[PDB]
Design an enzyme around this catalytic site. Structure first.
Site, PDB file in Angstrom:
ATOM      1  N   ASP A 189     -28.673 -29.617 -27.433  1.00 47.16           N
ATOM      2  CA  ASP A 189     -27.388 -28.986 -27.706  1.00 47.16           C
ATOM      3  C   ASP A 189     -27.458 -28.322 -29.084  1.00 47.16           C
ATOM      4  OD1 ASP A 189     -24.727 -28.296 -28.137  1.00 47.16           O
ATOM      5  OD2 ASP A 189     -24.072 -30.360 -28.447  1.00 47.16           O
ATOM      6  N   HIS A 345     -30.133 -32.190 -37.407  1.00 43.37           N
ATOM      7  CA  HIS A 345     -30.821 -31.063 -36.785  1.00 43.37           C
ATOM      8  C   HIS A 345     -31.353 -30.210 -37.937  1.00 43.37           C
ATOM      9  CE1 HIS A 345     -30.631 -30.548 -32.467  1.00 43.37           C
ATOM     10  NE2 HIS A 345     -29.415 -31.063 -32.444  1.00 43.37           N
ATOM     11  N   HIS A 379     -33.598 -33.375 -31.991  1.00 37.19           N
ATOM     12  CA  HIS A 379     -34.172 -34.295 -31.009  1.00 37.19           C
ATOM     13  C   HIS A 379     -35.577 -33.723 -30.813  1.00 37.19           C
ATOM     14  CE1 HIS A 379     -30.247 -36.005 -29.999  1.00 37.19           C
ATOM     15  NE2 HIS A 379     -29.771 -34.788 -29.806  1.00 37.19           N
ATOM     16  N   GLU A 404     -35.812 -33.020 -23.750  1.00 36.43           N
ATOM     17  CA  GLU A 404     -34.427 -33.157 -23.329  1.00 36.43           C
ATOM     18  C   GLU A 404     -34.217 -32.235 -22.141  1.00 36.43           C
ATOM     19  OE1 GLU A 404     -31.102 -32.732 -26.139  1.00 36.43           O
ATOM     20  OE2 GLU A 404     -29.765 -32.712 -24.395  1.00 36.43           O
ATOM     21  N   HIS A 406     -31.238 -32.301 -20.259  1.00 36.43           N
ATOM     22  CA  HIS A 406     -29.825 -32.557 -20.008  1.00 36.43           C
ATOM     23  C   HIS A 406     -29.205 -31.754 -18.865  1.00 36.43           C
ATOM     24  CE1 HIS A 406     -25.935 -33.905 -22.319  1.00 36.43           C
ATOM     25  NE2 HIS A 406     -25.913 -34.232 -21.039  1.00 36.43           N
ATOM     26  N   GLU A 449     -31.271 -37.555 -23.616  1.00 36.21           N
ATOM     27  CA  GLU A 449     -30.607 -37.028 -22.433  1.00 36.21           C
ATOM     28  C   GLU A 449     -31.508 -36.420 -21.361  1.00 36.21           C
ATOM     29  OE1 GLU A 449     -26.271 -36.063 -24.484  1.00 36.21           O
ATOM     30  OE2 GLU A 449     -28.006 -34.810 -24.958  1.00 36.21           O
ATOM     31  N   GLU A 525     -26.212 -42.514 -31.491  1.00 31.58           N
ATOM     32  CA  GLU A 525     -25.179 -41.509 -31.747  1.00 31.58           C
ATOM     33  C   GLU A 525     -23.796 -42.136 -31.646  1.00 31.58           C
ATOM     34  OE1 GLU A 525     -25.565 -37.727 -29.669  1.00 31.58           O
ATOM     35  OE2 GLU A 525     -27.710 -38.133 -29.410  1.00 31.58           O
ATOM     36  N   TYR A 526     -22.970 -41.915 -32.665  1.00 30.44           N
ATOM     37  CA  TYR A 526     -21.614 -42.457 -32.665  1.00 30.44           C
ATOM     38  C   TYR A 526     -20.763 -41.734 -33.711  1.00 30.44           C
ATOM     39  CZ  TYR A 526     -21.837 -45.109 -37.089  1.00 30.44           C
ATOM     40  OH  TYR A 526     -21.889 -45.487 -38.413  1.00 30.44           O
ATOM     41  N   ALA A 527     -19.451 -41.933 -33.658  1.00 25.81           N
ATOM     42  CA  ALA A 527     -18.543 -41.284 -34.605  1.00 25.81           C
ATOM     43  C   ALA A 527     -18.813 -39.782 -34.648  1.00 25.81           C
ATOM     44  CB  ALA A 527     -18.708 -41.888 -35.991  1.00 25.81           C
ATOM     45  N   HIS A 528     -18.513 -39.108 -33.541  1.00 17.73           N
ATOM     46  CA  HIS A 528     -18.711 -37.667 -33.420  1.00 17.73           C
ATOM     47  C   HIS A 528     -17.819 -36.983 -34.469  1.00 17.73           C
ATOM     48  CE1 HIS A 528     -18.678 -33.709 -31.201  1.00 17.73           C
ATOM     49  NE2 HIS A 528     -19.936 -34.068 -31.027  1.00 17.73           N
ATOM     50  N   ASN A 585     -21.404 -19.738 -23.211  1.00 15.59           N
ATOM     51  CA  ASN A 585     -21.590 -20.413 -24.491  1.00 15.59           C
ATOM     52  C   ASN A 585     -20.590 -21.556 -24.585  1.00 15.59           C
ATOM     53  OD1 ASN A 585     -19.083 -19.783 -26.237  1.00 15.59           O
ATOM     54  ND2 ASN A 585     -19.616 -17.780 -25.363  1.00 15.59           N
ATOM     55  N   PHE A 589     -18.504 -26.182 -30.163  1.00 14.39           N
ATOM     56  CA  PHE A 589     -19.133 -27.484 -29.960  1.00 14.39           C
ATOM     57  C   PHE A 589     -20.450 -27.677 -30.718  1.00 14.39           C
ATOM     58  CE2 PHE A 589     -20.679 -31.116 -27.362  1.00 14.39           C
ATOM     59  CZ  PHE A 589     -19.579 -31.939 -27.604  1.00 14.39           C
ATOM     60  N   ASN A 592     -20.504 -30.196 -35.478  1.00 11.34           N
ATOM     61  CA  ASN A 592     -20.130 -31.611 -35.412  1.00 11.34           C
ATOM     62  C   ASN A 592     -20.552 -32.354 -36.676  1.00 11.34           C
ATOM     63  OD1 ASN A 592     -21.975 -31.339 -32.355  1.00 11.34           O
ATOM     64  ND2 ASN A 592     -19.792 -30.851 -32.594  1.00 11.34           N
TER      65      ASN A 592
HETATM   66  O1  LIG Z   1     -24.837 -36.967 -26.580  1.00 12.51           O
HETATM   67  C1  LIG Z   1     -24.857 -36.060 -27.376  1.00 12.51           C
HETATM   68  O2  LIG Z   1     -23.678 -35.677 -28.010  1.00 12.51           O
HETATM   69  C2  LIG Z   1     -23.584 -34.586 -29.028  1.00 12.51           C
HETATM   70  C3  LIG Z   1     -22.287 -33.807 -28.801  1.00 12.51           C
HETATM   71  O3  LIG Z   1     -22.096 -32.845 -29.849  1.00 12.51           O
HETATM   72  C4  LIG Z   1     -24.812 -33.654 -28.976  1.00 12.51           C
HETATM   73  O4  LIG Z   1     -24.747 -32.841 -27.797  1.00 12.51           O
HETATM   74  C5  LIG Z   1     -26.080 -34.521 -28.955  1.00 12.51           C
HETATM   75  O5  LIG Z   1     -27.238 -33.694 -29.068  1.00 12.51           O
HETATM   76  C6  LIG Z   1     -26.174 -35.317 -27.648  1.00 12.51           C
HETATM   77  O6  LIG Z   1     -27.258 -36.256 -27.757  1.00 12.51           O
HETATM   78 MG   LIG Z   2     -27.759 -32.887 -24.719  1.00 18.03          MG
HETATM   79 NA    NA Z   3     -22.646 -30.523 -30.318  1.00 15.59          NA
END
Ligand SMILES: O=C1O[C@H](CO)[C@H](O)[C@H](O)[C@H]1O
Ligand SMILES: [Mg+2]
Ligand code: NA
Ligand SMILES: [Mg+2]
Ligand SMILES: [Mg+2]
Ligand code: NA
Ligand code: NA
Ligand code: NA
Ligand code: NA
Lengths: 1011, 204
Positions: A189, A345, A379, A404, A406, A449, A525-528, A585, A589, A592
């Site tokens: 992503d 990233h 990733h 990945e 996904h 993913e 991954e947590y707390a977006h 697109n 998003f 983040n």
């Molecule tokens: O699960 C996820 O959530 C995020 C959402 O922004 C982003 O897509 C990360 O690459 C993905 O691993």
């Molecule tokens: Mg992904």
């Molecule tokens: Na994202």
């Protein structure tokens, strides 16, 4: 042969992967890591030409420079130069899903370079070319002859050019394809770009050479003794006089050394490796490596003759540390880690995905300065310098394979297919072969993913077999499959379960004790942190600290992936998905992060820093208990500052040096506090300051803080009532209150304070009215994909219930005269097509002191979605330079994200009361405020508020911050109550129940007056 | 209770009484209560209460009002959680509805006397000719809080003159995880610092 449409062909004539080489011919240079004459950089100006497809490339290009080609800087992404548009898509592949085929219209980047090669380089030895990163595939030619092919955009591709080069002028021809079968494994992503985006260089090695070397360090139970084992491999002609010497250095002191001829121990019936040798060095009381104290030794590997003639030398920094999982806990040097990590990233707003040392150092400094001790390479393998910096500055690293898928359906369609095992294995094995000697890397990741396929199980085992010193994790297929040593969920919540079929996300606390489960849990991954977010962040840390097996996680993510564009005047602005004509697109998003693309911090960063603090505090009477969460270091660069203030007014303060052992406690007895005279709440604030500068911070750096309410003396002494008496003037359309030359006008048709006068000056541009809505935050919109709407998102519920369309209906408006004031009573009903959403009952009491006391009681229909806020708003005519308040601050803070904010007297310029989120939304709120000062106004009470030149209407109507325009006057939003911002994820309701305004009936009071 | 204010104003169609008290102990102001009583032409008395609680004093057991009514009626009728005794941290079993019980059932005979018989989430209470409306907690019986805390055995209690009514805007949890250490959970402690509740008293 269309090699870029065959997962079976991931390379042609590519050399074996290996750790960073420099081929030093001077042992001292190897030890001190000085530049090497044998390693040349080919970065700089190259010739570039863009074509719609590889079949469009003219053959004459292989031998002659194209006259139409441009001269561009390498490394770079050609989208950043404007040859074609960068594409931002999250899950959905940027190309039609039809593996292993790609579009016939495949953007092709023809790079070429004319460089000089000295004869000395071709008369002996081997000259190879190194491409650290080419996206996504490429063919290489040298002086017109085809050399090879390579895939995997995130690992170096090396080729032997010894037989292709000529003394003098040479020319390289590189055809880079944007799309390839490799793209099916690179669906991260992020912006989809391409080109030669990482360094390119030439390395000269002797024919007889060091071809690989692995360094390992094992210890005894108390880590008082260690053995450094170094396996060395060579290529070239074997001779009995050849020798390998491995020496270990600490600074300028050699602490150990070993020498031996080639020839390993017997391995099987056929003997052993005659071309390898393993040296073992004993080390007593080694200085251990950790993110706390990144002690490093230097290991030098010398290939030489028995009589002392050096052939070549290679080397690496060595960090003595042990990583192991025991009894369900991840341990580093025997102690259970607490991961304060973040996903990062490689992104630059101007250069795209080309990374530079300055940006890398800037990121590491900000990370450590904000209490992060770990980073995940989301990733894919990073630029090689990244690991060197992490080794030295001290950060735990999760090195992740570039895999990945996904967008596949199901997600494991490729990873469970043996036909893709070879392609996947190379992305895993070549990463390990490259970074296995970096001490900062403590965990290997199989990617992200891609569901859970048999290929993952095979590769999981390959790593366990090849490198036992590091745990292996992978989240795909449920976060707890047989392919991961650590339960590593993405966005699993603290207490709430999300029982999705097949791959449920259990509350992390519940996950740990599922029948038969024993592994440690660390969220990958947590707390977006998308936009105004990180609400509930504190809930994760309370849990991390209470549960031994909950060992932390990696926040998603570090930096906004926004890109720079310019308007007609050349002014730059931040762009996101779709701003380059790219479609489909996923718009915003891609943003983040905790920091903006230019590394300017988002308010959320301070919340993370505070929750990730390494010192915990408890107060009992007049004693402060300080507990250290450090595992290895003593607090030898910390002093505790404490200060007591009455409603912002300093009363007493002092300092006390901290001397706490790792995991230890220190008790600090505060002196006698002189009880204040005036009424008010006494607040105690403590902060840990680092007096001495470090490699990552300046002297005086604040690393931790906490506050406590001390004694409170309620105001019982009633103020001397003025002598003046307000007067009520009644007309059919209004109720006017007059005090001296001050006037308050209440419209009888609308029932709102429509205007106020200070002599001849008007005070309002818009009437003071109730507000129950907020320009939607990214978390309110809840969508990870631009095309997927959602009736369950908070914004859709509010819109469907008519919250943004609610019209006020006056139910009552009366005026009464009191002995020393005028009382205005009103009641309004907000309805939508017959349905009453909220009812607001108010009373305005203006006294002889010119103070207007406003009492507000609101009823909220139980069946309407809980409102975003319950307050009042108005557009003030005034535009002042400063904003002063007694409350939580100084930075932006919301109900579920205000633990980092401190109660005190703050004063900032108006501009700072507005947070410039690229995608505009409600912002700049400050909670627990008892007094607000702006221009001639002063509001007192207990409310939350934000103030700026942007109305909630413009904010919710504008997609980009650069498109915002200051409005006349100043928009003020004073809330008695405000809904949480949430953030556990940004694609489903994430505001916790306790932060939703569901009480049904609310009460708050404000006092408005001049100053 | 120390009186700080007590005024009376005549409005268009009502009389407004405003008061303010402070409860102190050895110079320490524990609580501050500010109220307004609005009596309109319909005979209804609207009582608005706003209380301040010193952040450093132990969180109070309840925030309400009480009085001993001269009336002694046979039944108690209320629209709220019931029919049985229920407290903030022990009211999941109770249901919201119109309940009607004899006065005696509004008292729980715990062998060791204490606060008892509370009913929460009540919007309407009816006793004799009286009616109280709002959103409150209440308990009603022939025993004052004073007698209950001074009496060791239930068989020693004696019905007092009239009926004691305790109408609370807020009431602390009863706890129970154990009975030998504070067991009331933070979410059920009255620690907000500032509290507000309004009641309408009239005759039916
Ligand atoms: O699960 C996820 O959530 C995020 C959402 O922004 C982003 O897509 C990360 O690459 C993905 O691993
Ligand atoms: Mg992904
Ligand atoms: Na994202
Ligand atoms: Mg291929
Ligand atoms: Mg340098
Ligand atoms: Na833990
Ligand atoms: Na110290
Ligand atoms: Na917006
Ligand atoms: Na008793």
């Amino acid at each position: 042969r269309r090699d870029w449409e065959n997962p079976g062909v991931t390379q042609l004539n590519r050399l074996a992967a290996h750790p960073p080489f420099a081929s030093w011919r001077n042992s001292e240079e190897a030890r001190t890591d000085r530049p090497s004459q044998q390693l040349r950089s080919l970065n700089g100006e190259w010739r570039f030409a863009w074509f719609p497809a590889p079949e469009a490339v003219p053959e004459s290009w292989l031998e002659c420079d194209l006259p139409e080609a441009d001269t561009v800087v390498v490394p770079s992404n050609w989208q950043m130069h404007g040859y074609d548009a960068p594409i931002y898509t999250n899950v959905t592949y940027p190309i039609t899903v039809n593996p292993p085929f790609v579009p016939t219209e495949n953007p092709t980047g023809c790079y070429s370079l004319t460089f000089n090669v000295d004869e000395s380089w071709l008369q002996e030895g081997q000259t190879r070319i190194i491409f650290d990163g080419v996206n996504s595939a490429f063919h290489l030619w040298c002086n017109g002859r085809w050399v090879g092919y390579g895939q995997d955009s995130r690992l170096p591709s090396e080729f032997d050019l010894s037989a292709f080069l000529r003394a003098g002028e040479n020319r390289l021809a590189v055809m880079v394809l944007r799309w390839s079968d490799g793209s099916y494994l690179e669906d991260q992503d992020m912006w989809r770009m391409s080109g030669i985006f990482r360094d390119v260089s030439l390395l000269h090695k002797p024919t007889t050479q060091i071809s690989d070397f692995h360094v390992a360090t094992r210890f005894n139970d108390d880590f008082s003794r260690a053995v450094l084992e170094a396996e060395v491999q060579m290529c070239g002609e074997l001779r009995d006089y050849l020798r390998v010497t491995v020496s270990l250095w600490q600074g300028e002191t050699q602490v150990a050394s070993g020498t031996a001829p080639f020839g390993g121990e017997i391995i099987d019936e056929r003997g052993g490796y005659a071309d390898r040798v393993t040296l073992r060095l004993n080390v007593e009381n080694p200085k251990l490596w950790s993110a706390e104290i990144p002690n490093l030794y230097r290991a030098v590997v010398e290939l030489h003759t028995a009589d002392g003639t050096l052939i070549e030398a290679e080397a690496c920094d060595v960090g003595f540390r042990e990583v192991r999982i025991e009894n369900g806990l991840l341990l580093l040097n025997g102690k259970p880690l607490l991961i304060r990590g973040v996903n990062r990233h490689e992104h630059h707003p101007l250069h795209g995905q080309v990374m530079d040392e300055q940006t890398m150092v800037q990121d590491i400094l900000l990370m450590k300065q904000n209490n992060f001790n770990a980073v995940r390479c989301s990733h894919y393998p990073n630029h090689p310098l990244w690991y060197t910096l992490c080794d030295r500055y001290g950060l735990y690293v999760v090195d992740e394979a570039n895999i990945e898928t996904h967008g596949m359906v199901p997600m494991n369609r490729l990873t469970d297919d043996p036909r893709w095992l070879p392609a996947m294995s190379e992305r895993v094995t070549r990463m390990v072969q490259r970074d296995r000697n970096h001490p900062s890397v403590i965990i290997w990741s199989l990617g992200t993913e891609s569901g859970h396929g048999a290929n993952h199980d095979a590769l999981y085992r390959w790593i366990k077999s090849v490198d036992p010193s590091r745990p292996v994790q992978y989240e795909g297929g449920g976060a707890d499959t047989t392919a991961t040593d650590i339960i590593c969920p993405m966005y699993a919540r603290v207490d709430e379960d999300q029982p999705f079929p097949a791959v449920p996300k259990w509350s992390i606390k519940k996950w740990l004790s599922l029948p038969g489960e024993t592994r440690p849990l660390i969220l990958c991954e947590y707390a977006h942190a998308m936009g105004n977010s990180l609400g509930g962040f504190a809930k994760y840390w309370q849990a991390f600290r209470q549960y031994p097996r909950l060992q932390g996680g990696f926040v998603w993510d570090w930096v906004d992936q926004s890109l720079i564009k310019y308007d007609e005047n050349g002014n730059p602005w931040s762009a996101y998905g779709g701003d380059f004509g790219d479609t489909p697109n996923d718009r915003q998003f891609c943003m983040n992060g905790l920091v903006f693309a230019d590394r300017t911090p988002h308010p959320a960063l301070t919340e993370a820093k505070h929750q990730q603090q390494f010192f915990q505090f408890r107060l009992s009477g007049q004693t402060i208990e300080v507990t250290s969460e450090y595992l290895f270091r003593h607090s030898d660069n910390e002093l505790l500052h404490w200060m007591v203030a009455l409603d912002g007014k300093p009363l007493a303060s002092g300092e006390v040096p901290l001397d706490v052992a790792p995991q230890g406690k220190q008790l600090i007895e505060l002196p006698e506090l002189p009880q204040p005279e005036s009424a008010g709440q006494l607040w105690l604030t403590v902060r840990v300051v680092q007096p001495n500068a470090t490699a990552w911070s300046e002297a005086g750096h604040i690393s931790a803080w906490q506050q406590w309410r001390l004694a409170e003396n309620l105001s019982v002494t009633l103020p001397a009532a003025s002598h003046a008496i307000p007067h009520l003037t009644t007309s059919e359309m209004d109720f006017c209150i007059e005090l001296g030359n001050k006037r308050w006008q209440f419209n009888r048709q609308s029932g709102f304070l429509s205007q106020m006068w200070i002599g001849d000056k008007k005070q309002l541009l818009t009437p003071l009215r109730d507000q129950f809505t907020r320009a939607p935050l990214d978390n309110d919109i809840g969508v990870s994909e631009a095309t997927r709407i959602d009736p369950n998102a908070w914004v859709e519920r509010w819109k469907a219930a008519g919250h943004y369309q609610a019209e006020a209906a006056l139910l009552q408006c009366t005026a009464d005269t009191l002995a020393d004031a005028v009382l205005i009573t009103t009641a309004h009903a907000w309805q939508h097509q017959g349905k009453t959403l909220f009812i607001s009952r108010k009373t305005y009491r203006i006294d002889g002191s010119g103070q207007m006391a406003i009492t507000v009681d609101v009823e909220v229909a139980s069946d309407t979605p809980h409102p975003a806020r319950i307050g009042l708003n108005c557009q003030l005519a005034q535009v002042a330079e400063r904003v002063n308040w007694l409350g939580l601050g100084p930075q932006e803070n919301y109900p579920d994200r205000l633990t980092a904010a401190c109660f005190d007297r703050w004063d900032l310029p108006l501009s700072d009361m507005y947070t410039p989120y690229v995608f505009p939304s409600e912002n700049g709120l400050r909670c627990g405020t008892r007094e607000l000062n702006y221009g001639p106004h002063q509001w007192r009470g207990d409310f939350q508020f934000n103030i700026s030149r942007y109305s909630q209407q413009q904010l919710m109507e504008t997609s980009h911050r650069h498109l915002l325009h200051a409005e006349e006057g100043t928009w003020l939003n004073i809330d008695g109550f405000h809904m949480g911002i949430g953030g556990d994820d940004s694609w489903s309701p994430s505001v916790s129940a306790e932060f939703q305004l569901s009480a049904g009936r609310y009460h708050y009071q404000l006092v408005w007056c001049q100053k």
